Amino acid sequence: MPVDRILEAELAVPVTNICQAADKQLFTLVEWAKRIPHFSSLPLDDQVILLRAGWNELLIASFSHRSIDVRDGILLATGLHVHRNSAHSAGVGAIFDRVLTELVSKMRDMRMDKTELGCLRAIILFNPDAKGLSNPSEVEVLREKVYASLETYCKQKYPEQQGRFAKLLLRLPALRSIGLKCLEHLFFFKLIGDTPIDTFL
Amino acid sequence: MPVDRILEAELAVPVTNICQAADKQLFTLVEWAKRIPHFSSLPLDDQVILLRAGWNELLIASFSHRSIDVRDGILLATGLHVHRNSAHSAGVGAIFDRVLTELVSKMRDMRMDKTELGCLRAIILFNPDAKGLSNPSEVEVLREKVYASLETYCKQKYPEQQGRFAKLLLRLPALRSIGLKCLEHLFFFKLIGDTPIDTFL
Amino acid sequence: MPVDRILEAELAVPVTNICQAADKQLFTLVEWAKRIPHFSSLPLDDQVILLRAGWNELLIASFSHRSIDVRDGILLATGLHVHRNSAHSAGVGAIFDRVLTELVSKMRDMRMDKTELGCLRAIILFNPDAKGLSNPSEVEVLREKVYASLETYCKQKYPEQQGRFAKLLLRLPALRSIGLKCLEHLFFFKLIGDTPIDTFL
Amino acid sequence: MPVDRILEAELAVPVTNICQAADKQLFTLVEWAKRIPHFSSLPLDDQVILLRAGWNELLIASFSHRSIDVRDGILLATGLHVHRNSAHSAGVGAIFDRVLTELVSKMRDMRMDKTELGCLRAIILFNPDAKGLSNPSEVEVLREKVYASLETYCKQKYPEQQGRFAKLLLRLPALRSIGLKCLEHLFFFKLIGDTPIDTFL
Amino acid sequence: MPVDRILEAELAVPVTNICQAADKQLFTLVEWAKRIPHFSSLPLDDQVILLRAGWNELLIASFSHRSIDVRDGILLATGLHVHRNSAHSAGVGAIFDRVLTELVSKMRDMRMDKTELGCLRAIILFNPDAKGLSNPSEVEVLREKVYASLETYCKQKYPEQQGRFAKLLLRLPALRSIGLKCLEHLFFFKLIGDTPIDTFL
Amino acid sequence: MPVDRILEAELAVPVTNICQAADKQLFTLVEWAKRIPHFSSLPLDDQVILLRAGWNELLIASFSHRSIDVRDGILLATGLHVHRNSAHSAGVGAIFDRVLTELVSKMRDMRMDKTELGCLRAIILFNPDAKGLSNPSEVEVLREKVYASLETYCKQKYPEQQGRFAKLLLRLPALRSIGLKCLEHLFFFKLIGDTPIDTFL
Amino acid sequence: MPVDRILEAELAVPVTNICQAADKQLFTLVEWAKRIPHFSSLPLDDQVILLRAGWNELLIASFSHRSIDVRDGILLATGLHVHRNSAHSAGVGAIFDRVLTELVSKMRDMRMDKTELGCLRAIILFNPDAKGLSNPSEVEVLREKVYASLETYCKQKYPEQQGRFAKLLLRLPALRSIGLKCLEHLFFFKLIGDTPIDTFL
Amino acid sequence: MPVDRILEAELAVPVTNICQAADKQLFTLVEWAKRIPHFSSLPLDDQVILLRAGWNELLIASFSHRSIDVRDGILLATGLHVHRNSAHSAGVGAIFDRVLTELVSKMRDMRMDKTELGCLRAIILFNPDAKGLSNPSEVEVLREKVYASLETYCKQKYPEQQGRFAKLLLRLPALRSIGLKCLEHLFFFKLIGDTPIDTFL
Ligand SMILES: Cc1cc2c(cc1C1(c3ccc(C(=O)O)cn3)CC1)C(C)(C)CCC2(C)C
Ligand SMILES: Cc1cc2c(cc1C1(c3ccc(C(=O)O)cn3)CC1)C(C)(C)CCC2(C)C
Ligand SMILES: Cc1cc2c(cc1C1(c3ccc(C(=O)O)cn3)CC1)C(C)(C)CCC2(C)C
Ligand SMILES: Cc1cc2c(cc1C1(c3ccc(C(=O)O)cn3)CC1)C(C)(C)CCC2(C)C
Ligand SMILES: Cc1cc2c(cc1C1(c3ccc(C(=O)O)cn3)CC1)C(C)(C)CCC2(C)C
Ligand SMILES: Cc1cc2c(cc1C1(c3ccc(C(=O)O)cn3)CC1)C(C)(C)CCC2(C)C
Ligand SMILES: Cc1cc2c(cc1C1(c3ccc(C(=O)O)cn3)CC1)C(C)(C)CCC2(C)C
Ligand SMILES: Cc1cc2c(cc1C1(c3ccc(C(=O)O)cn3)CC1)C(C)(C)CCC2(C)C
Ligand SMILES: [Cl-]
Ligand SMILES: [Cl-]
Ligand SMILES: [Cl-]
Ligand SMILES: [Cl-]
Ligand code: NI
Ligand code: NI
Ligand code: NI
Ligand code: NI
Ligand code: NI
Ligand code: NI
Ligand code: NI
Ligand code: NI
């Protein structure tokens, strides 16, 4: 798990606008995955499963980081902005605030670099809890390798900050909850979309 | 639009089982699209849009054809079978019958070849009605090229059958309706999945 | 299956206003059907079935064509207009746009004539996928006759445009989807009509 | 408004089976209406409106009468039977009992003839309460003519039975309520039809 | 069934306001019933059943008649008025219009007297279709007596108007439908009452 | 407030069966109320209001007491029984158990007499919290008179039991909750009654 | 069961604001309970059960009393106010009025002291109807002790008012109903909270 | 922030059974919190907020660990067992499997000790993402202290296992998701509880 090969993979890459943005990102997510050290060696079936389970947390981590320099807002993969106001107006205010508060702003205060982001992603990607994996222990092994390199990296680049490694990992539960919330809102809009119901709201 | 280029793209590639099957197929759908003659030259944004709008009709056409030699059933991209009985038992009986009646059996009686399938796919892929396309006329142009080559092909290989070209095109509306129905059932199961409600049925 | 006999059948003939319009059209739909070449020879039971399955696509095609010269709007069978604005205000904006974009405007650019419209209708009428038909192959035969005459007609009147026949057929899937959408909205309004709920919206 | 001409109009003509039955009957309802004395002279718009408002009461009166000689059941316009048992099993037990109790059996005890049935129908057809009629007073006039001839007829053929005329009219409110109930069940089945929900039931 | 004893019984007697009004009327409905000729002789159980089945049609007939001299409105048993405007604003516009159009205005044009009203009431009261009556034939007999006296009365007081009797009876189906509608709205308001839901609307 | 006047008023008087039972009881509830000391002197409007707010608690108290000698069951005002088993089978098990546990059995252990029951009733009847009362303090005054006589009575007949008066009053909150629950179940059954949904359970 | 020990337990201690207020109060509710005379001696299991069943009535009684000197409003345990206006604006108007009318204002007119409040609380706490109590009679015994001391206290401090004891107890049913209502609204807000639905309202 | 004091706090302490179990645990949760090093020094308001946000994850971690020696099941705080079978039968199968798979079994394979459990708990308790905290940075500081001691402890007791610390933290996202799922099921059961709906299930 050379952390360098991971950083390389990263570099290698309102509701209507946000969903199209997510789309653009999904269009090349398999490409990104294929760049992570041993992902390609996992059974093809284990690969789809890992991606199916982590796609939105992954994306939520990507756009969050990319938005570190946006004034109370998010920077879509599409180039457009979405600010706290539009989000509230669109009915996705509460979760949008979680994004800024729990992910964006906190990734900004730590000055979380790409290498670190990629790792967190790589980690969420190698999720042993993914249902139906052929060999879970295998997957487990690949993630402990990632956070091993990751902890090392953090010790090298940020020796003054000894608790950064943990601190980084502690952003994963926030990505977990936000993600579940994301999918819930996604259902809703998908359910009321293009029906007179939507015109209402 | 060389029809051979298309055929090459094709060759290049119960509810829980069916969804995992669809997943496996989505994992490489972009790859398939990238093999169609001029798809890659369309703006990236127009590419995601075309795929978002045609993914399930596309997949429904693929598994339908692949199932031509299955006794009252479907042959998943996963290798497993799903027969009319399991489908009814799973609550997806009515649409499952549409698949066999309107797509599978009719693709079987015509002895619809891969070249022809790929074209129909290529056609659904180049859908000018896709919302948000930058250059729609451009997309329109690419599909009329596909069905031009397609009609030619049909004239060459099946001269005795002069109405086959139309006959082929007339399977598209069935894919349209079945597809919409598919997504509806997909919502439902996605909606009650992993909830005590699912235990109920 | 002379195309002339079909053209003669054609010639032979906001939500509250739209529904009353649809009504006026249903009042004589059987008459129109009875004018199509061999429709009357099909078992009576097969006749009701064909009409039950195609009534709204049929009507949607009729009013769409009739609206070719309306500024961003639809020309009801009642003489009244309904413009993009009223539709959005009424909550049927999204589908109304599909009508104008996918049907009206595209029928207008092609300068789709009555003879061609009638055929498309005749074709949707002879739908072999109609559930419960006694003799499906019989119905299949009648539609391939229609599109045979239709392709011929298109070759005669528009020799310069060799792809027009296909192009015409490719409007059927749009009528399929729009139609299903239509029925869905119809349920909704039928469900909240004359109830305090409708007042609230 | 001769009762004879009415009688002539009449003579002139489980849930899946019942609905197809209703369909068969709708296929020629306009024909039946066109045979009633002055219906054809009413504005075309007033004609559609009258049929839209009375179609199911009308049909419910037709099949009820037709079922006078059926053992605890209904005789569909399709020839098939539906017995109290199938109806209960299908979830339409309560209203089905109203049909037999309030309409069928009571039409059977009175030995209600076709002439009388036709009139009741003609009466429901000329409904001044129909929303949107151009000239309601005109419609009102046509119905009082019908029940005028009807009362006369009843005095002629059944002199010993002086209260029969009223007795007949008093079956109209039962047709009204049953009809509204019918449409409600119709929504429900149309709403859960061909969806996994249906399979559950 | 002396019609006089009936008239005697009659003489003997916005949503929040309307319901309290209905209440006031229910408080003495048994009293009114007890005044109808043979009602008291029917088994006590048959009496509750008749009242349970006819209470709202009865009341709807009472307030409708009482409102004959109100400008586009209803005169509650409470003395207060409710005009077409408040009703629409309250979400009960559609049914409120049926009341005025189908009942009030039509009772006004005929100059329907109390004696006639009472009879219609007495008639709805003696409803043989009431579920669970011990002796229905008995009830049937009492209603044919009422409309016998009623027809006689109409012949005496209004000899020039020979069709008035029928005309009167023909208002019963309108009371039937309006009544069912009434109960439906009643459920709704009872369902959303005193919940933040109501504050909304 | 003579307690004897009250006792005199009292003496003066599965889901389908239970509701018909409640009906029988409502048929004469006004009569019972009119027998309570000063109820008749309250404005008529205040009378309907008190009855509207207390009808089910009142009835629930009546049938509960009447059921003191029933083996795990309730004795309807109709003479029929309903036992813990039928209730559970009917879906009203939980509340039915509250009736037996909180009301019946506890009224049985205390050997709660009619005089005491009537009072509790009289008390619930004179409810100052009833919304819309003209003179609330007046109503308040009448209930404190009732429980004054009540406490006296309890001191006279049961001198050994000094806490019985309180104990009696402490059964009112149980009648309050059970009552609200009752109305809720009543909505539900009223909501799915006579619909295929009811056939379902 | 000295009333003094209870008074000492008491002394010992817009929707978003109200819920946080309730929270603050729950944070120390067990502490309060542990201060009531024999509560701690009851099986631990019986203790949780009593608190689970009475927590909101208890809290509702606490904040109501604490609000005796607030102009048409409530004084949260948080120090903040919530006035009749904010409540209506928040959709909790109806129940909020019940609080002021049935609890606050009435506790204010009686000049209900802390000792008396505590008792009422202690009483609701020792609720024998609590489902699953191991020894119910035990609990029953503890509440009759409370209202025994309470009645005594009321006789001592307020000899001129002999009906005060009853009067106090008669506030319990109002706390029962208001409480059930409270929980219902609580579900609703908990159900639509942080969802686009809450935004819309 | 000595891990010892944490360990000491820990030591210091089917759906109907599970909820009563959760209850028993809530009854003393504040006590447990008060034992964590600096929790008591945080503003009282910050204390309630932290507990409100972490109560179920906390409990879910407690019962999970406690269940390490249960054959395919959970060991309630009540002493009772709940096995995979009862859970599925109760409709909570899917989440129950997540508990065993993601928490129980994985806590069992690592041989996760109490000291480590307590820490994870202490960590979830000091959640800076808790909405409405007065001083979040303060809370953040307390959690980094906990995982600092925790990492140290893990290095001391398990020197051969260098990745255990991370491995432990990586169980937090699973607790997050499971927790959200838990609350969702909790709503559902609370919503259909004690209603005929419950009896159906
Ligand atoms: C689709 C989607 C929808 C939403 C969100 C996130 C996404 C995701 C995503 C990921 C990446 C990008 C991008 O890079 O531009 C855009 N979107 C899919 C996770 C949040 C959380 C903002 C709440 C608002 C809604 C509308 C519910
Ligand atoms: C996901 C999906 C779900 C369903 C269907 C089709 C798919 C699709 C798909 C595509 C490809 C493959 C494959 O290659 O095996 C399998 N499935 C996505 C279109 C049908 C229509 C069978 C109805 C039953 C349900 C369960 C609703
Ligand atoms: C009833 C109906 C309702 C609607 C539509 C079409 C019809 C149909 C129809 C048929 C014929 C005519 C006419 O001749 O004027 C008009 N309408 C029945 C198909 C569209 C698609 C406009 C979406 C808006 C809604 C309100 C959902
Ligand atoms: C469509 C329809 C559906 C239903 C009914 C009646 C009809 C109607 C009808 C009319 C005519 C014929 C016939 O001639 O055979 C049959 N049915 C339309 C009125 C009843 C009342 C039986 C309740 C059961 C359901 C399933 C709800
Ligand atoms: C309760 C009730 C509610 C409603 C109506 C009628 C009544 C009834 C009634 C009868 C008599 C009186 C009176 O004499 O004042 C008042 N109300 C019960 C029939 C109509 C139809 C106006 C629709 C509006 C709503 C609010 C649905
Ligand atoms: C109508 C009603 C329905 C129900 C109940 C009580 C009544 C009431 C009542 C009053 C009196 C009598 C009688 O005298 O026999 C019978 N019932 C109206 C209060 C309980 C609580 C048993 C729950 C079961 C359901 C079906 C929900
Ligand atoms: C949570 C809660 C919500 C609500 C209420 C009461 C509470 C409770 C409570 C307890 C204590 C305190 C306090 O000390 O300030 C405040 N509130 C929990 C009972 C009322 C009745 C005001 C209706 C409005 C809603 C929003 C439904
Ligand atoms: C209340 C609750 C309900 C449920 C669960 C967990 C709890 C919680 C809990 C905590 C502690 C204990 C105990 O110590 O025995 C038991 N349960 C509250 C988290 C799971 C996850 C099993 C899903 C099944 C349902 C029924 C939805
Ligand atoms: Cl911007
Ligand atoms: Cl048969
Ligand atoms: Cl006025
Ligand atoms: Cl066990
Ligand atoms: Ni910006
Ligand atoms: Ni097979
Ligand atoms: Ni115009
Ligand atoms: Ni038969
Ligand atoms: Ni007025
Ligand atoms: Ni018995
Ligand atoms: Ni204030
Ligand atoms: Ni066990």
- What is the C-alpha separation between A154 and F181, in angstroms, rounded? 61
Compute, in angstroms, the gap from residue E32 CA to the centroid of ligand 18.
37
C1 close to A (CB below 8 A): no
* HSE-CB for B121 with a 13 A CA cutoff: 31
For residue E27, the ligand closest to its alpha carbon is 5
Secondary structure in 3-state letters for E81-131:
EEEHHHHHHHCCHHHHHHHHHHHHHHHHHHCCCHHHHHHHHHHHHCCCCCC
Contact E107, E178 (CB under 8 A): no
**H75: DSSP letter:** E
Structural tokens at position E99: 């009341």
Number of inter-chain CB pairs under 8 A, A vs H: 58
Q: Is the CB of E64 under 6 A from ligand 5?
A: no
B75 lines ligand 2 (CB under 6 A): no
Burial (CB count within 10 angstroms: exposed 0-12, middle 13-18, buried 19+), residue F137: exposed
Residue among H60, H89, H191 whose CB has most ligand 8 atoms within 8 A, to mutate: H60
- Shortest distance between the Cα of E16 and any Cα of chain G, in A, equals 13
Q: Which residues of H touch G190 (CB under 8 A)?
A: 187
Q: Which residue shows structure tokens 């050379």?
A: A2
F191 touches chain G (CB under 8 A): no
Spell out the long-range contacts of G164-168 with Cβ–Cβ below 8 A and sequence spacing 24 or more.
G164/G110, G165/F166, G166/F144, G166/F147, G166/F151, G166/F165, G166/F166, G166/F169, G167/F144, G167/G110, G168/G110, G168/G112, G168/G116, G168/G119, G168/G120
Q: Strands, E, within B1-144: which ranges?
A: 73-75, 81-83
Residue E124: CA atoms inside 13 Å, Cβ hemisphere, count?
Answer: 28
Calpha distance F186→H197 (Å, rounded): 13
* Residues in chain H after which the backbone breaks (C–N beyond 2.5 Å): 13
State the smallest CA–CA distance between residue G96 and chain E in angstroms: 10
Name the experimental technique. X-ray
A91 — phi, psi (to 5°)? 90, 5
How many Cβ contacts (< 8 angstroms) between chains C and D? 40
Q: Which atom of ligand 5 is nearest to the CA of E92?
A: 24
Answer positive or negative: Cα dihedral of D46, D48, D53, D56: positive
Pocket lining: H95 vs ligand 8, CB cutoff 6 Å:
yes
Residues in chain A: 201
Closest among B50, B60, B194, B63 to B136, alpha carbons compared = B50
Q: Cα separation of B184 and B191, whole Å?
A: 11
Write out the residues surrounding ion ligand 9, Cβ under 5 A.
Answer: A 81
Amino acid at A91: G
Interface test with D, best of E110, E131, E167, E169 (most D CBs within 10 A): E169
Q: What six digits make up the tokens of D1?
A: 């408004």
Q: Are A58 and A125 in contact (CB under 8 A)?
A: yes
User: Which sequence spans correspond to the domains of chain D?
Assistant: 1-201
Ligand 10 centre to CA of D87 (Å) is: 12
Ion ligand 20: residue ranges with CB closer than 5 A: H 81
Helix (H) or strand (E) holding A18: helix A15-26
Q: Determine contact: E55 vs chain D, CB below 8 A.
A: no
Cα separation, A21 vs A89, in Å, equals 19
The residues with which D82 forms a beta bridge, in sequence order, are D74
Residues with CB under 6 A from ligand 4: D 15, 18-19, 21-22, 25, 56, 59-60, 62-63, 76-78, 92, 95-96, 99, 182, 185-186
Name the CA radius of gyration of chain C, rounded.
17
Question: Which three-class secondary structure state does DSSP give residue B82?
Answer: strand
- For residues D86 and D70, is the Cβ–Cβ distance under 8 A? no
C-beta of E51 in contact with ligand 5 (< 6 A): no
In the chain, the amino acid numbered A173 is P
Q: What distance in Å separates the CA atoms of residue F131 and residue G95, rounded to the nearest whole number?
A: 12
Three-class HEC string of chain D = CCHHHHHHHHHCCCHHHHHHHHHHHHCCHHHHHHCCCCHHHCCHHHHHHHHHHHHHHHHHHHHHHHCCCCCCEEECCCCCEEEHHHHHHCCCHHHHHHHHHHHHHHHHHHCCCHHHHHHHHHHHHCCCCCCCCCCHHHHHHHHHHHHHHHHHHHHHHCCCCCCHHHHHHCCHHHHHHHHHHHHHHHHHHHHHCCCHHHHHC
CB contact under 8 A, H195 and F201: no
**D170 burial via Cβ count (<10 Å: 0-12, 13-18, 19+):** buried
- Ligand 13 centroid to Cα of residue A71, in Å, is 7
**Distance between D15 CA and the closest CA of chain C, angstroms:** 14
Q: What is the DSSP letter of G126?
A: S
Angle at the Cα of A38 from the Cα atoms of A32 and A42, rounded to 5 degrees: 95
* CATH architecture assignment, domain D1-201: Orthogonal Bundle (1.10)
Nearest alpha carbon to residue F196 among C87, B169, D185, H154: D185
User: Which tokens in the block code for residue D116?
Assistant: 């009388």
Residue H20 Cα to chain centre, angstroms: 16
Residues G184, B117: Cα–Cα separation, whole Å: 57
CB contact at 8 A, A39 and A186 = no
The shortest C-alpha distance from D43 to chain B (Å) reads: 38
Nearest CA in chain H to F91: H196
Q: CB of C181 within 8 A of CB of C157?
A: no
> Which residues in chain H are closer than 8 Å to B194, comparing Cβ atoms?
94-95
**Ligand 8, pocket-test mutation among H55, H177, H182, H188, most atoms within 8 A of CB:** H182
Q: How many residues are there in chain E?
A: 201
How far, in Å, CA of H122 to CA of H117, rounded? 9
Q: Which pair of tokens denotes residue D111?
A: 């030995």
* Pocket-forming residues, ligand 6, beta carbon under 6 Å: F 15, 18-19, 21-22, 25, 56, 59-60, 62-63, 76-78, 92, 95-96, 99, 182, 185-186
Cα of A43 from ligand 1 centre, angstroms: 29
Whole-number Å distance, alpha carbon E167 to ligand 17 midpoint, is: 29
CB E187, CB F195: distance < 8 Å: no
- What's the half-sphere exposure (Cβ side, CA atoms, 13 Å) at A80? 14
Backbone angles phi, psi at A78, to 5 degrees: -95, -5
Q: Tell me how far apart the 2 most distant CA atoms of chain D are, in Å.
A: 57
**C-alpha to C-alpha distance for G180 and H45, rounded to whole angstroms:** 27
Chains touching E by CB (3 or more pairs below 8 Å): C, D, F, G
* C142 CA from centroid of ligand 19 (Å): 80
- DSSP-derived secondary structure for H110-163: HT--HHHHHHHHHHHHS-TTSTT-S-HHHHHHHHHHHHHHHHHHHHHH-TT-SS
Cβ-based contacts of F184 with chain H (< 8 Å): 195
Evaluate whether C191 touches D187 at the Cβ level (below 8 Å): yes
Which of A30, A48, A191 is opposite residue B187, by nearest beta carbon? A191
Provide the token pair at F110.
Answer: 């205390």
Of D88, D184, D189, the CB nearest to F199: D88
What is the Å distance from ligand 7's center to G123 Cα?
Answer: 20
Can you spell out the DSSP letters for G57-116?
HHHHHHHHHHTTTSTTEEE-TTS-EEEHHHHHHHT-HHHHHHIIIIIIHHHHHHT--HHH
Could you tell me if A199 lies within 8 Å of chain C, comparing CB atoms? yes
What one-character DSSP code corresponds to residue B155? H
C-B interface (Cβ pairs under 8 Å ≥ 3): yes
Task: List, in sequence order, the alpha helices (H) in chain F.
Answer: 3-11, 15-26, 29-34, 44-66, 84-90, 93-98, 105-110, 114-125, 136-157, 164-169, 172-192, 196-200
Q: Which residues contact G89 (CB under 8 A, 6 or more apart)?
A: G14
Distance G80 CA to ligand 19 centre (A): 8
Write out the DSSP string of chain E.
Answer: --HHHHHHHHHT--HHHHHHHHHHHHTTHHHHHHTSTTGGGS-HHHHHHHHHHHHHHHHHHHHHHHTTTSTTEEE-TTS-EEEHHHHHHHT-HHHHHHIIIIIIHHHHHHT--HHHHHHHHHHHHS-TTSTT-S-HHHHHHHHHHHHHHHHHHHHHH-TT-SSHHHHHHTTHHHHHHHHHHHHHHHHHHHHHTTSHHHHH-
Query: Ligand 4: which residue has its CA nearest to atom 9?
Result: D22
Q: Which two tokens stand for residue D192?
A: 């859960």
Q: Residue D176 corresponds to which tokens in the numbers above?
A: 């009204």
Q: How far apart are CA F193 and CA F199, in angstroms?
A: 9
Nearest to C99 by CA among C175, C19, C186: C175
Which of E24, E47, E51 is the closest to F48 by Cβ?
Answer: E24
Quoted resolution (Å): 2.7
d(CA H47, CA G20): 12
DSSP-derived 3-state class of residue A2 = coil
Other Cβ atoms closer than 10 A to F178: 21
Distance CA H70, CA H39 (A): 33
- Give me H24's structure tokens: 């028993």
